Symmetry: D2
Subunit: 333 residues, 4 copies
């Protein structure tokens, strides 16, 4: 099913308590949503499907190019599909900067607020406010008001301090975050504290992650809140998960990462069999030498099924890397 | 917008009165729905989006493989998208044989009946009962009861007499159809009377259409109903529209075809630029010689945008071939 | 075997007498020479292999880029190969303009003159002087001296009046040609009289051949020589044979074409299976996703055999189009 | 130039004295010969071009399939080309087993014997007798008689003890070899003593070379001949050079390898740009959607130039790996 707000909060609480995380898979279409959910199910895992501003625009079609329309249309599709799977699927929106709040996150929040006010559940279960490009005090001022609105609509807010490339979060930024927002008692929030994360996939030695930054952030927060030195007040989000080393993922989990974003690696997994299909069927997908091609290989389903299955396999890998495989809160073993 | 039942009936009535038709485009995904609607809009045309049993299964994902789920999920997606376009978009389900009625058309009819009963409109605006594989009397017995159910849910029923290859309808089949169902006064129905139609795309000289069969059917019905010899009591559906000659389409329109199904040709249009993208970007969509590929070309949006635009262009062509271009009932000129 | 000068003159005389012609296939390599000769043999035909200035440069390798070296090296290769086939194979050099005579045709003539002077046969059996870019009187002045040199080395000279595109020869050019060179009694020559010929392959309606120009040339020559009106004093060469219509080839044969040059069409035939091989074996000819490819498909012989066989088939087609198939002067039936 | 017998013996003597080796590149065509020689020249190196039984068959064309014809034709081509380069190029024939001696090595030896007897030099400068599949005494009986014949024709004989995969030579095989053949004073020979060599290219950890076997062989021979313990009486040949580690090549050189065979790696280098050309020019090398392709990209020279240049680069790499780069005996610096 779609995760209810209660189930999603329980998911994140269980992940945090047990030092595992969920994949948050960027999707752009019916096929990619289907691939992501089948991946979670095949892994016996709960999971998160997320739409970026660009993914939502793409989802709305070239004739519309509207983020809200694409996100709503894909979310409505996902609600129907997720009802047919035993695992819990949460819907999220990815990076929304200041100049897009009025045309993405705010209108979507309003849609969920009206669903709530009629006794229903929100359309999305979390939204990202990415204020990393503005000064920390402005970022957290916007965050504080968005958190109030999100919590009232039964929605978790993700925020970002530090910039994701494709830098490293400061100790005072961690302190300000706890001061402005508390530690969940004013509404749950997820913190994308950057620690050398880069969007994309590069050769080894390029990306230089420093997970100790997350460890330091937990200690700074714990001290601020008068908690024991081993407390983990933040629920962290790991951006740019694709291409990461196993050892890097493990250390991040130990310091309270509960959500790792995946996009590039699932993109490659989706496209790879499509590429192979076109080459081995070159004289079927092209009308060559006066021939009329071969419908059974230019039928989009023929290669998109393969794309879907391949992307699902990569999502299974993500669930095993993040140690959420076999841990769905529905307990279908 | 999505066509209301009233708008759809007006669409079909206007097409019939003016000897034009609408394309009915088989879709399987968010991208193909988007491509079809943008095609209608670019042509200033109303149009029909249809889901086959296989398309619906595909739409539901490999983890579900359920026709109702796929059709509902894609229909809900389409409702959100179509609201953002000035033209009217009707939703239809394609060939449903006897052994699939209980798992496709009937449950979908029930969903729409419950929407109606609450003061709303049906989810789909037409459904196809394909009884061509059973004897004519059984076909029309099922048709009569389905027509009553469809009409009560504000839905138009498409039926088929004769088999689509990939044969030719008999005069007594036309007579029985009018006798069993009337001429619209017991609920509007569309008649796929086959006249040599074949699903697929072949070289010229293979497919042998006989449009005079449709002309004969109108005359047989007109005589049965005591109407003038030039009356056209049937609203015909032209299956297997892809690969057809212009001259063949024109003659069919003259005899009362109001809906022409397109699938194969839009499949080729969708896939063609994807094939081209994979070849010209071979070293970006594949990780070759120890390199890591190029994310900006293995991002599914990069080639799927091209696929969408190409399929839209083919849909524009269909609207101009069928003479519905520039005739949308919203009159946005 | 390689055609002796006596056999080559007999070949051309027989073709002329019987209104057929030989293909002259442009070759650039051991593989293409092999493909051309196997084509002649499979057709039971004699034939001509020709090297252009660019083909000879290519044959000499990127480290040399010398026309004489490439032509000699490929000719020596061809002498060994042709000895193993029952049919007669003549060697020719293609278009040599004024500024390349000193670095192509003249040095090659000198090589053959020294072979002759020792009691052997020439290395090449014909050479082309292409003087079409200079005024007719200069063209024929050079032709007259080259003809004397060629004949003394047992070599036939091909000349060109009119330009091949990628225009139409004048009546006075035909008259001057007979006046300057005679009709074979001062040494045999072949005349590339252009009649709308274009190098390359285009869609129909582009290239506009006028074979009546050749008919007029024969009549002009016949009148000059005091011969009957149906005499054919010229042995014509048809440049740009690829892409030509059957009807066009037939008319040209009737007017005395004895040699038709083929290049573009044999190029496509050679490359086509190589293209197919790369696509269907994409993951064998490329090291993909950390794999090491597949030696049995990146072995050049694997696709070059296919290229060779395909080009041979196109050469067989040329022999049947030109009506030299089954007519080799060795009579191996 | 082509290596004279005197120059080739000097080449091998210099390599041995200075612990370097020459690449022996398997070639099959005018293009691959051209690529190999340009590689040697670009490296300022002497080198060896070799034809296998299969390469020679391929060189003779599908219409002939005769090893002697292909080897002679390619050798004659190579004689013309090599005269235009400052470096010395030796011609060799690769593995010839017992049942092919009468149809490859023996007839080629006879051709060279007749050239010698007229005061010329041999066509090939070395021939391989591969008797590894027969018992050692039979192998060396055949070797002894072939060595006498080869030496009399100014040709060096390569022999093989041990089998190349795609095993390890025994101490008594080394002893028998010196006893039967001496150490050069009855004619120079090259010894392919196998030490775990495999033809082909595999992932690391598969091929398990044991160069100490060569070291042991030199010591066994030195003791037999009453030479100092550090003497190297054998000139070794390293089969299956492609895919080898640098460290492995270095150790083999120290123990007296003077010739390393390369085939698989130059095959990949040749094919790789052809593959790339076909993909990026897919709509030029194929006639697609009613178009006629693009002659400038289906011209075989367009991709074969790229193939030639790429293979030359790999040959340069081989000269630097084997430490013969910059050491050509013509001293063109
Ligand atoms: Na990344
Ligand atoms: Na069709
Ligand atoms: Na042409
Ligand atoms: Na190897
Ligand atoms: Zn991110
Ligand atoms: Zn459990
Ligand atoms: Zn149909
Ligand atoms: Zn209007
Ligand atoms: Zn020409
Ligand atoms: Zn005969
Ligand atoms: Zn070997
Ligand atoms: Zn030097």
């Amino acid at each position: 099913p779609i995760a209810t707000p209660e189930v999603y909060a329980e998911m994140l609480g269980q992940a945090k308590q047990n030092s595992y995380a969920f994949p948050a898979i960027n999707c752009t279409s019916s096929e990619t949503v289907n691939a992501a959910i089948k991946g979670f199910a095949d892994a016996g895992s709960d999971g998160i499907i997320q739409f970026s501003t660009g993914g939502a625009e793409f989802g709305s079609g070239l004739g519309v190019k509207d983020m809200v329309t694409g996100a709503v249309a894909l979310a409505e599709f996902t609600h129907v599909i997720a009802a047919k799977y035993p695992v819990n699927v949460a819907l999220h929106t990815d990076h929304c900067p200041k100049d897009k709040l009025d045309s993405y996150v705010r209108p979507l929040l309003a849609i969920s607020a009206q669903r709530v006010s009629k006794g229903g559940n929100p359309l999305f279960q979390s939204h990202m406010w990415d204020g990393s490009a503005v000064p920390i005090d402005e970022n957290l001022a916007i965050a504080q008001e968005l958190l109030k609105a999100a919590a009232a609509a039964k929605i978790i807010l993700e925020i970002e301090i530090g910039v994701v490339g494709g830098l490293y979060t400061s100790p005072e930024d961690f302190e300000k975050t706890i001061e402005a927002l508390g530690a969940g008692e004013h509404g749950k929030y997820l913190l994308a504290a950057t620690f050398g994360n880069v969007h994309g996939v590069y050769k080894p030695g390029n990306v230089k992650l420093r997970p100790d930054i997350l460890a330091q952030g937990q200690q700074v927060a714990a001290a601020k809140l008068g908690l024991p030195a081993d407390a983990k007040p933040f629920d962290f989000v790991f951006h740019g998960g694709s291409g990461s080393l196993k050892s890097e993922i493990e250390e991040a989990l130990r310091y309270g990462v509960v959500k790792m974003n995946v996009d590039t690696d699932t993109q490659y997994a989706f496209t790879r069999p499509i590429a192979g299909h076109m080459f081995t069927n070159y004289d079927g997908v092209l009308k060559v030498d006066g021939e009329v091609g071969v419908k059974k290989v230019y039928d989009p389903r023929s290669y998109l099924k393969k794309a879907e299955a391949s992307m699902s396999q990569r999502v299974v890998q993500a669930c095993n890397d993040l140690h959420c495989a076999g841990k769905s809160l529905t307990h279908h073993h």
